[PDB]
Structure 1
Amino acid sequence: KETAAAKFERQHMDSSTSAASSSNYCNQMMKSRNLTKDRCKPVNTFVHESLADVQAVCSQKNVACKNGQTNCYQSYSTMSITDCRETGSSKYPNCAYKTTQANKHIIVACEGNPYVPVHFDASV
């Protein structure tokens, strides 16, 4: 199986680059991080910061989650992030995505010990 924190890192962590390289970044990343293994993950955001910085958000601003949960936190500063969304002409197994780079405040849900991100709620 896969832990909740490991899935987060796998799906949303990309310290490798500082920004979404080109407009094909998403098509590559969604494939490499196995987000299109047996299905095309329709939407997914990647964070371009260290793991440390992303985990630190679990001890920053405590905001409400979109689903109502009270374990979401918002990063005090904006972060470099890439939003990946399936294009209208996309379909498993040939998944297609639109890359959208931006610096926004990430909002993640945290849990466990250590208290780390286990779900990407959104970016503002």
Structure 2
Amino acid sequence: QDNSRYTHFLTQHYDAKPQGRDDRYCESIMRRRGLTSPCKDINTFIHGNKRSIKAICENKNGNPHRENLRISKSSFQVTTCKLHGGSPWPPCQYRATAGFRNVVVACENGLPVHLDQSIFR
């Protein structure tokens, strides 16, 4: 029916139109999306519409990749938020890295349920 994992994916990895994707963007959205207790070490948000991202799950915008993942054909505007300061607890200071590249996800039932973070490390 519903997919709580696709819902979690959106919360953790999707931001439709961010505007300025600087450090303070990261600090605000990381707190907003509930990722600051403890501070998530690295988290990347995808921008634009959701139908492009879903389409990574189909032949449309994706290919099978590695053990059980999928890799997009199209590039996406992304913003990676990376923790600095060696303390895992708030306040969480983030460095933003805007990117434009293809993304790796895992899908269930045609829906993204996981973002592979490693390609942004």
TM interval, shorter chain, is 0.7 to 0.9
Q: What's the CA shift for 1:3? A: 1.4
Task: State the partner residue of 2:33.
Answer: 33
Of 79, 89, 100, the match for 1:103: 100
Q: For 2:47 and 2:7, locate their aligned partners in 1 and report how far apart those are by CA, in whole Å.
A: 17
Q: For 2:21 and 2:81, locate their aligned partners in 1 and report how far apart those are by CA, in whole Å.
A: 13
Task: State the partner residue of 1:4.
Answer: 5
Gaps of 5+ in 1: none
Q: For 1:91 and 1:20, locate their aligned partners in 2 and report how far apart those are by CA, in whole Å.
A: 25
The change in CA–CA distance for 1:104 and 1:20 in structure 2 (over 3 A counts) is farther
Q: Deviations over 1:20-42 (max 9, x none)?
A: 53332111110111111x21111
Q: Deviations over 1:91-115 (max 9, x none)?
A: 412111110001011100111x3x1
Aligned positions of 1:51-62 closer than 5 A: 51-59=50-58, 60-62=62-64
After TM superposition, the score normalised by the length of structure 1 is: 0.82
Q: What's the CA shift for 1:88? A: 2.4
The change in CA–CA distance for 1:5 and 1:81 in structure 2 (over 3 A counts) is same
Q: Is the 8 A contact 1:47 1:80 kept in 2?
A: yes
